[PDB]
Amino acid sequence: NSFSGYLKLTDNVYIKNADIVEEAKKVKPTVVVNAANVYLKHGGGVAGALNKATNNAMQVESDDYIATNGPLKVGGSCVLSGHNLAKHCLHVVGPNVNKGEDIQLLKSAYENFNQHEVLLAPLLSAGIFGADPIHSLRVCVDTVRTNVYLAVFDKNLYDKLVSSFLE
Ligand SMILES: Cn1ncc(-c2cc3c(N[C@H](c4ccc5c(n4)OCCO5)C(C)(C)C)ncnc3[nH]2)c1C#N
């Protein structure tokens, strides 16, 4: 858990302008969070990037999990192998408000982080999932009680998030 160059926002939330994949390779965290969908199909965005960094091992394991257990619920999660990126990957489904899912489920989504003492994570429901990223950061800060290190791979968004937190 050798996190470096983060800005501490609260006693348990840290943030950095970084690619979560590159962070996972450097840090070797105990848990990396995947911004997943309910069928664990890592087809693009940050899920596709984490899967590609495992040379598709994450996708094969995910397909096997879905066959036995069925899909996740929106707001839910599962723990699978971290492969070469972490000890464990916590696959979390935030709501996709661009597809009509309820933004209130973002609190349920961040509540999954509280089962793990230290996590490397992306900003849930942001990007093409359509949530307001400032609102996602506020829900993270108000919900997560364990130690979370947020990697946001966009300097423009990072600066807007920090300037909002510090108002
Ligand atoms: C080809 N490639 N290599 C690396 C990455 C990469 C993306 C990425 C990231 N994306 C954030 C995010 C966060 C929650 C998302 C989402 N995206 O997409 C819908 C699902 O929910 C965002 C957009 C807000 C900055 N955040 C952190 N590290 C990251 N690495 C990619 C891609 N794509």
From Swiss-Prot:
It catalyses: Thiol-dependent hydrolysis of ester, thioester, amide, peptide and isopeptide bonds formed by the C-terminal Gly of ubiquitin (a 76-residue protein attached to proteins as an intracellular targeting signal). Changing T30A: In strain: Mu/B.1.621. It is found in: Host endoplasmic reticulum membrane. It is a multi-pass membrane protein. Residues 1-167 form the Macro domain. Inhibited in vitro by GRL-0617. Responsible for the cleavages located at the N-terminus of the replicase polyprotein. Participates together with nsp4 in the assembly of virally-induced cytoplasmic double-membrane vesicles necessary for viral replication. Antagonizes innate immune induction of type I interferon by blocking the phosphorylation, dimerization and subsequent nuclear translocation of host IRF3. Also prevents host NF-kappa-B signaling. In addition, PL-PRO possesses a deubiquitinating/deISGylating activity and processes both 'Lys-48'- and 'Lys-63'-linked polyubiquitin chains from cellular substrates. May form homohexamers. Interacts with N protein. This is Papain-like protease nsp3. It comes from Severe acute respiratory syndrome coronavirus 2. The chain holds residues 1026 to 1192 of 7096 of the full protein.
